[model samples]
Target: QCTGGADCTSCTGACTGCGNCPNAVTCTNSQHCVKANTCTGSTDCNTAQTCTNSKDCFEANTCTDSTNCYKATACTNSSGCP
Candidate 1:
């Protein structure tokens, strides 16, 4: 199976197969292996901005700092990073 979430072009946001991509493009939200050419999360994208799996290329105002930028599901508290 494709391990790299970003590099894996398996399903077109449908998470179907292992290597049967309907489109050659990659998706910003690796959670959904589909290429939408748009942002799918709560973040917003500008005209010349593009969101990537590793970085959200739109307005980076949601995060106050690098600490606040990253989040962990296993983190019990909000102080995981500083």
Candidate 2:
């Protein structure tokens, strides 16, 4: 995915499905870029939340309830509650 090390940030790619990014040669999704805190998917969090393309959640946030918790990878099947 990289022609040169600089491409990791200067270059771009596609999301393929729902968990990939348009950039970051080392990162499969947004986790590799500053945009990781953005949500392009609309199925979850009607109010709003964040999703990293890397498929995980962490570091910092004001998260709460099922709405926001619904987007986290670990929230899976999360069993009807968020």
Candidate 3:
């Protein structure tokens, strides 16, 4: 579980779970974020990537350089390979 100043210390592949991301939220190298709010961040969400309600999508795009981008929502930038 994480509170305000949420930072998931560089979440890796098959990233397990992080709880209720509050302000200062930053989840890195990501996957499987159960819930997220404003200012969400994900970098290089690889195969089978999915996103929702992601605002200010950055770091080369939310779900950047993806394949099997299973589903994306409110996307600004992302490149797929599937």
Candidate 4:
């Protein structure tokens, strides 16, 4: 049913459905997927925690943290989370 091109269908390309794309890796709190690397954005870690290389925003703050401090190349708090 695909008329766009050869890479339109899931059988052709590595498409895993809309939001289920395997290419989109899940990142942790204080870290986010950037290209292929996990990057840290505006993370404010507590005294007991440190913003490591793979740390995501969630790791820095609780689940109730503000969404404005999280960012990534292809993912953001608004688009990536519920």
Candidate 5:
């Protein structure tokens, strides 16, 4: 099932971006996930980026420190970056 929310720990399915984490972390183990500029911190996505999933963690601003990518096929960055 697909889900969406904030401040989550284990997002294994299609879910929303985890917000306000200590590192501005996004989603994990998600079949699909996303993130926003609201997420702060330089480490925003250190170990916080998407994982073993597709079309995940589409971040704006921040998330530079994060992988910002994984197991994706058509993922693209409009803010610039390959």
Candidate 6:
């Protein structure tokens, strides 16, 4: 499993963080897995930045707001980097 660490490509399962991923398959900001149908529960996702599906998180922000990035989820439009 992935710890949701910054710049990680292996943790493709879920992205309960503050950034976005490519293919929009990495959860918006938190909660369920990246891809759809992975939304197990509501506790998975947290703040507003977080997304319910992978596509929304990956496409919505996608690290566009570097100025507001902080966690491993932020600034991770596609590469999941810090």
In the range 1-82, model 2's lDDT, one tens digit per residue, is: 3232323444354222333233522232222343333333212222223432222234213232223344344443222223
For residues 1-82, what per-residue lDDT tens digits would candidate 3 score against the true structure? 3432345434332232343232213343333343322223433322223443332232222343332333444243443322
Q: What's the true lDDT of residue 1 in model 4?
A: 15
lDDT of predicted model 1: 0.29
lDDT of 4 by residue, 1-82 (tens): 1122223223222222222111222222321122212222312222212123332333232222233224323232322223
lDDT of 5 by residue, 31-53 (tens): 21233222222223323233222
Give per-residue lDDT, candidate 2, residue 25. 25
What C-alpha lDDT, on a 0 to 100 scale, does residue 29 get in candidate 3? 32
| Model 4, residue 20: C-alpha shift (Å) | 21
Runs in model 1 lying further than 4 Å from the true structure:
1-8, 13-36, 42-55, 58-82
**Which predicted model would earn the best TM-score?**
6
TM-score of each: 0.20, 0.24, 0.23, 0.16, 0.22, 0.25
Report clash pairs, candidate 4.
Answer: 29-56, 29-57, 29-58, 29-59, 30-55, 30-56, 30-57, 31-55, 31-56
By TM-score rank, best first, the candidates go 6, 2, 3, 5, 1, 4
lDDT of 2: 0.32
**Alpha carbon lDDT of residue 38, candidate 5?**
29
State the lDDT of candidate 1 residue by residue for 20-79, as single tens digits: 233423333333323433332312222112233222223322222112223323222222
Error of 2 at 50 (Å): 1.5
Segments of candidate 6 deviating more than 4 angstroms? 18-24, 28-82
The window of 10 residues in a row where model 5 has the poorest summed lDDT is: 31-40
Q: Each candidate's lDDT (Cα)?
A: 0.29, 0.32, 0.33, 0.26, 0.32, 0.33
Better of 2 and 6 by lDDT: 6
